[PDB]
Enzyme design. Structure first.
Site, PDB file in Angstrom:
ATOM      1  N   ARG A   1     -50.609  47.357  12.052  1.00 34.79           N
ATOM      2  CA  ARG A   1     -49.443  46.610  12.409  1.00 34.79           C
ATOM      3  C   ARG A   1     -48.667  47.700  13.389  1.00 34.79           C
ATOM      4  O   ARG A   1     -48.042  47.085  14.354  1.00 34.79           O
ATOM      5  CB  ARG A   1     -48.444  46.636  11.330  1.00 34.79           C
ATOM      6  CG  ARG A   1     -47.615  45.368  11.626  1.00 34.79           C
ATOM      7  CD  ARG A   1     -46.230  45.666  10.925  1.00 34.79           C
ATOM      8  NE  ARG A   1     -45.397  44.611  10.827  1.00 34.79           N
ATOM      9  CZ  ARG A   1     -44.098  44.268  10.553  1.00 34.79           C
ATOM     10  NH1 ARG A   1     -43.445  45.118   9.994  1.00 34.79           N
ATOM     11  NH2 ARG A   1     -43.297  43.423  11.343  1.00 34.79           N
TER      12      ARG A   1
ATOM     13  N   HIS B   1     -47.522  46.315  17.468  1.00 36.65           N
ATOM     14  CA  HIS B   1     -46.278  46.232  17.969  1.00 36.65           C
ATOM     15  C   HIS B   1     -45.889  47.168  19.103  1.00 36.65           C
ATOM     16  O   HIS B   1     -45.069  46.943  19.820  1.00 36.65           O
ATOM     17  CB  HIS B   1     -45.440  46.795  16.755  1.00 36.65           C
ATOM     18  CG  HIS B   1     -44.999  45.432  15.959  1.00 36.65           C
ATOM     19  ND1 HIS B   1     -44.119  45.297  15.079  1.00 36.65           N
ATOM     20  CD2 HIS B   1     -45.636  44.232  15.811  1.00 36.65           C
ATOM     21  CE1 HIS B   1     -43.959  44.183  14.538  1.00 36.65           C
ATOM     22  NE2 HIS B   1     -44.872  43.538  14.928  1.00 36.65           N
TER      23      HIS B   1
ATOM     24  N   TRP C   1     -51.615  37.897   1.926  1.00 36.49           N
ATOM     25  CA  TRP C   1     -52.227  36.801   2.251  1.00 36.49           C
ATOM     26  C   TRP C   1     -53.333  36.466   1.526  1.00 36.49           C
ATOM     27  O   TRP C   1     -54.167  35.556   1.515  1.00 36.49           O
ATOM     28  CB  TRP C   1     -52.687  36.844   3.807  1.00 36.49           C
ATOM     29  CG  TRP C   1     -51.517  37.043   4.801  1.00 36.49           C
ATOM     30  CD1 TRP C   1     -51.049  35.834   5.361  1.00 36.49           C
ATOM     31  CD2 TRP C   1     -50.548  38.166   5.023  1.00 36.49           C
ATOM     32  NE1 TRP C   1     -49.694  36.289   6.154  1.00 36.49           N
ATOM     33  CE2 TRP C   1     -49.774  37.715   6.040  1.00 36.49           C
ATOM     34  CE3 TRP C   1     -50.625  39.455   4.702  1.00 36.49           C
ATOM     35  CZ2 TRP C   1     -48.994  38.424   6.764  1.00 36.49           C
ATOM     36  CZ3 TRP C   1     -49.774  40.380   5.582  1.00 36.49           C
ATOM     37  CH2 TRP C   1     -48.670  39.674   6.491  1.00 36.49           C
TER      38      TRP C   1
HETATM   39  C1  HEM Z   1     -47.484  35.080  15.590  1.00 40.14           C
HETATM   40  C2  HEM Z   1     -47.848  36.442  15.675  1.00 40.14           C
HETATM   41  C3  HEM Z   1     -47.401  37.409  14.358  1.00 40.14           C
HETATM   42  C4  HEM Z   1     -46.468  36.998  13.499  1.00 40.14           C
HETATM   43  C5  HEM Z   1     -45.143  36.367  13.662  1.00 40.14           C
HETATM   44  C6  HEM Z   1     -46.652  38.357  12.537  1.00 40.14           C
HETATM   45  C7  HEM Z   1     -45.786  38.432  11.605  1.00 40.14           C
HETATM   46  C8  HEM Z   1     -45.656  39.391  10.757  1.00 40.14           C
HETATM   47  C9  HEM Z   1     -44.883  39.804   9.491  1.00 40.14           C
HETATM   48  C10 HEM Z   1     -43.558  38.866   9.375  1.00 40.14           C
HETATM   49  C11 HEM Z   1     -45.620  40.724   8.737  1.00 40.14           C
HETATM   50  C12 HEM Z   1     -44.904  41.407   7.602  1.00 40.14           C
HETATM   51  C13 HEM Z   1     -43.883  42.562   7.615  1.00 40.14           C
HETATM   52  C14 HEM Z   1     -43.332  43.298   6.698  1.00 40.14           C
HETATM   53  O1  HEM Z   1     -42.915  42.879   5.671  1.00 40.14           O
HETATM   54  O2  HEM Z   1     -43.814  44.457   6.588  1.00 40.14           O
HETATM   55  C15 HEM Z   1     -46.855  41.087   9.501  1.00 40.14           C
HETATM   56  C16 HEM Z   1     -47.720  41.973   8.691  1.00 40.14           C
HETATM   57  C17 HEM Z   1     -48.571  42.405   9.509  1.00 40.14           C
HETATM   58  N1  HEM Z   1     -49.049  42.132  10.558  1.00 40.14           N
HETATM   59 FE1  HEM Z   1     -48.494  40.403  11.377  1.00 40.14          FE
HETATM   60  N2  HEM Z   1     -47.842  38.869  13.006  1.00 40.14           N
HETATM   61  C18 HEM Z   1     -48.262  38.586  13.967  1.00 40.14           C
HETATM   62  C19 HEM Z   1     -49.348  38.938  14.352  1.00 40.14           C
HETATM   63  C20 HEM Z   1     -50.186  40.010  14.275  1.00 40.14           C
HETATM   64  C21 HEM Z   1     -51.346  40.468  14.596  1.00 40.14           C
HETATM   65  C22 HEM Z   1     -51.773  39.724  16.274  1.00 40.14           C
HETATM   66  C23 HEM Z   1     -51.724  41.580  14.137  1.00 40.14           C
HETATM   67  C24 HEM Z   1     -52.912  42.653  14.447  1.00 40.14           C
HETATM   68  C25 HEM Z   1     -53.855  42.895  14.854  1.00 40.14           C
HETATM   69  C26 HEM Z   1     -50.909  41.578  12.825  1.00 40.14           C
HETATM   70  C27 HEM Z   1     -51.205  42.558  11.807  1.00 40.14           C
HETATM   71  C28 HEM Z   1     -50.427  42.771  10.855  1.00 40.14           C
HETATM   72  C29 HEM Z   1     -50.640  43.592   9.705  1.00 40.14           C
HETATM   73  C30 HEM Z   1     -52.085  44.352   9.660  1.00 40.14           C
HETATM   74  C31 HEM Z   1     -49.427  43.340   8.545  1.00 40.14           C
HETATM   75  C32 HEM Z   1     -49.420  44.051   7.183  1.00 40.14           C
HETATM   76  C33 HEM Z   1     -48.649  45.098   7.474  1.00 40.14           C
HETATM   77  C34 HEM Z   1     -48.253  45.973   5.872  1.00 40.14           C
HETATM   78  O3  HEM Z   1     -48.959  45.585   5.168  1.00 40.14           O
HETATM   79  O4  HEM Z   1     -47.387  46.743   6.160  1.00 40.14           O
HETATM   80  N3  HEM Z   1     -50.026  40.558  12.961  1.00 40.14           N
HETATM   81  N4  HEM Z   1     -46.971  40.276  10.267  1.00 40.14           N
END
Ligand code: HEM
Ligand code: HEC
Lengths: 103, 294
Positions: free
Chosen positions: B48, B52, B191
């Protein structure tokens, strides 16, 4: 090893998919009660990849530890999505816990 | 004037090996501090962070992007859609002190590459050369996605990064990793079941579970499956778009494919905006701890 440790390791790394209590419900993973002493792929009313069934190994603390190190190396095709416990203590600590929790 | 040009410049006489060392440090430490977040580890958060720091890119004027390692400035660091990444920043400051020559940009991305490979994902070619840029290059907050939207905001948010439908669906499979934390973002839950190992669970869950929309405690709505998982609006939107949905089915069916598109995309994501002279070294493929006896 320590069974208090094993406990948090299990709650932290296995719990999302598995119960140990008797009657306990399958989840992603089978209910693990009375694992030890049983053959791999026997839990009832749980659907196992043919791979978990066709390996048929008795679960003893030993083959079990090789398994946890790397579930896909052990039972290729298995669908359990775990990276493995690379640490012997961890493995000790967990097994010991399990030993005891899945009685 | 045309946009800004960002030439990748290799760190003064460093080479693969110098970079395989950084990986090893990061990799090991992921092996060492495994208690993080109820034993999920630092895997998900580093991937993540990688996303970002790269996701601020704007192809129209070429600003934002991984190049500048600007996440290290407060403005960026403090962007509210960046909540929870401080945990990823801390995890690598140590390693940075160990290797002070590598740029910030090269560290944040190498880190996501390590985490994917270390969690058993595919190999991700990677390149060095990012260069650190003054506090002035810091992108304003707000270039990152909202969760509360649908297929169409998604398709369009991504044309700004220069990604197509297949690349957007592949990238999203990264949602197999970690979970959402209500204190960070208003959503809560994972998820899937293997939060720390890289598979295509994301897509089988999307299509085999039974989702019901509901409100969390933060007062937002999300889709919850009986099995304990959740899906954000933006994830669910992937199966409501006829076009997103056939890529989702491909992938649920064939992991290799997913694995191949993801690697192509993730790297494309990390290199956006950067010009590599024709003299720079071919992208590197690093070895895992497993491949090195560990
Ligand atoms: C429409 C685009 C996206 C949206 C709205 C989005 C939204 C989110 C949100 C709201 C979270 C949780 C945040 C938290 O509580 O820490 C998250 C976690 C995460 N996102 Fe996405 N995301 C998007 C695309 C992606 C993409 C493109 C990747 C990676 C290549 C990604 C990788 C991850 C991962 C690995 C986590 C888990 C982080 C953790 O376990 O702390 N996301 N995402
Ligand atoms: C999902 C994300 C899981 C996690 C994390 C863990 N387990 Fe697992 N387990 C899971 C599945 C889906 C299955 C069946 C796989 C198949 O290929 O059919 C399993 C299987 C086991 C077994 C074998 C059960 C039997 O042979 O009857 C054992 C002993 C087991 N799992 C234990 C275990 C431990 C100790 C875990 C964490 C350290 C763990 N599992 C994580 C799903 C998931």
């Amino acid at each position: 090893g320590s069974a208090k440790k094993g406990a948090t390791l299990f709650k932290t790394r296995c719990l999302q998919c598995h119960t140990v209590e008797k009657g306990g419900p399958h989840k992603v993973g089978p209910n693990l009660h009375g694992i030890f002493g049983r053959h791999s792929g026997q839990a009832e009313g749980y659907s196992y990849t043919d791979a978990n069934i066709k390996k048929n190994v008795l679960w003893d603390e030993n083959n079990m530890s090789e398994y946890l190190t790397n579930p896909k190396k052990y039972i290729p095709g298995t669908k359990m999505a775990f990276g493995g416990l690379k640490k012997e203590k961890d493995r000790n600590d967990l097994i010991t816990y399990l030993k005891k929790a899945c009685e | 004037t045309t946009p800004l040009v960002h030439v990748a410049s290799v760190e003064k006489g460093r080479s693969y090996e110098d970079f395989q060392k950084v990986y090893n440090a990061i990799a090991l430490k992921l092996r060492e501090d495994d208690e993080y977040d109820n034993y999920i580890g630092y895997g998900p958060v580093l991937v993540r962070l990688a996303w970002h720091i790269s996701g601020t890119w704007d192809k129209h004027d070429n600003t934002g992007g991984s190049y500048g390692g600007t996440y290290r400035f407060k403005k960026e660091f403090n962007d509210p859609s960046n909540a929870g990444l401080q945990n990823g920043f801390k995890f690598l400051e140590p390693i940075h002190k160990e290797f002070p020559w590598i740029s910030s940009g090269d560290l944040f991305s190498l880190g996501g590459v390590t985490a994917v490979q270390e969690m058993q994902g595919p190999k991700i070619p990677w390149r060095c050369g990012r260069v650190d840029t003054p506090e002035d290059t810091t992108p304003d907050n707000g270039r990152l996605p909202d969760a509360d939207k649908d297929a169409g905001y998604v398709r369009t948010f991504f044309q700004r990064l220069n990604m197509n439908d297949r690349e957007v669906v592949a990238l999203m499979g990264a949602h197999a990793l970690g979970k959402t934390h209500l204190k960070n973002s208003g959503y809560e839950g994972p998820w899937g079941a293997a939060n720390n190992v890289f598979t295509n669970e994301f897509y089988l869950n999307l299509l085999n579970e039974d989702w019901k929309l509901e409100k969390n405690d933060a007062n937002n709505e999300q889709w919850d499956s009986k099995s304990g998982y959740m899906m954000l609006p933006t994830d669910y939107s992937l199966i409501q778009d006829p076009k997103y949905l056939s890529i989702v089915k491909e992938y649920a069916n064939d992991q290799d494919k997913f694995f191949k598109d993801f690697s192509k995309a993730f790297e494309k994501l990390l290199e956006n905006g950067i010009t590599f002279p024709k003299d720079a070294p071919s992208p590197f493929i690093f070895k895992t701890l497993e491949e090195q006896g560990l």
